[PDB]
């Protein structure tokens, strides 16, 4: 039919649209699981007694990212938002099973 | 310092490993967020009276895959993995606040 039809494209686009972000979340997650055994070693790194001495070595490179004063910072401020975000969403998904 | 060095290199492993995986999780979050909306249709479409009827049509095409036996199935299946994923994670980032 052509109003069968109807259905089966909206249904189709639908999906189309939410599948992929449904499989690259997962993706994402299980790669990030794998390495977040490290953050507090990152976290604790930055703003240590040890971090600001090498911070103020007279390098003759361009001194790491990881001993600026923003780079850890910044990570430690996107960690913090994401377990946010993920406190919020467990819930709703406890919700839609 | 020779010592010096090798504290730093580790630290710059570590971040760069790590990093990476902390962005794709947050960016892969933040589009799933955005579509999330549209899951229970999906799983409500699934299983129900007009997906059967509409599967079991003589179309004239290979059937939508929305159609088939399986592909929503795998789909609850693989939301309903992330929701116990997503809900095991959280107090876990929090500890980490
Ligand atoms: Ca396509
Ligand atoms: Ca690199
Ligand atoms: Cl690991
Ligand atoms: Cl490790
Ligand atoms: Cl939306
Ligand atoms: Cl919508």
Redesign the interface.
């Known amino acids: 039919?052509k109003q069968?039809q109807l259905?089966?494209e909206k249904?189709?686009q639908?999906?189309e649209?939410?599948?992929p972000?449904?499989?690259?979340?997962?993706?994402?997650?299980d790669?990030?699981?794998?390495?977040?055994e490290?953050?507090?070693?990152?976290?604790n790194?930055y703003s240590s007694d040890?971090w600001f001495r090498?911070a103020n070595?007279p390098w003759d490179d361009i001194?790491?990212?990881?001993?600026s004063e923003d780079?850890?910072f910044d990570?430690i401020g996107?960690?913090?938002?994401?377990?946010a975000?993920?406190?919020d969403?467990?819930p709703?998904?406890?919700k839609?099973?």
Chains 1, 2 share one sequence.
């Open positions: 039919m069968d259905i089966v249904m189709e639908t999906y649209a939410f599948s972000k449904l499989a690259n979340l997962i993706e994402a997650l790669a990030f699981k794998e390495h977040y490290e953050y507090a070693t990152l976290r790194f040890e090498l070595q001194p790491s990212g990881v001993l780079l850890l990570m996107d960690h913090n938002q994401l377990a975000d993920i406190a969403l467990a709703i998904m406890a839609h099973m």
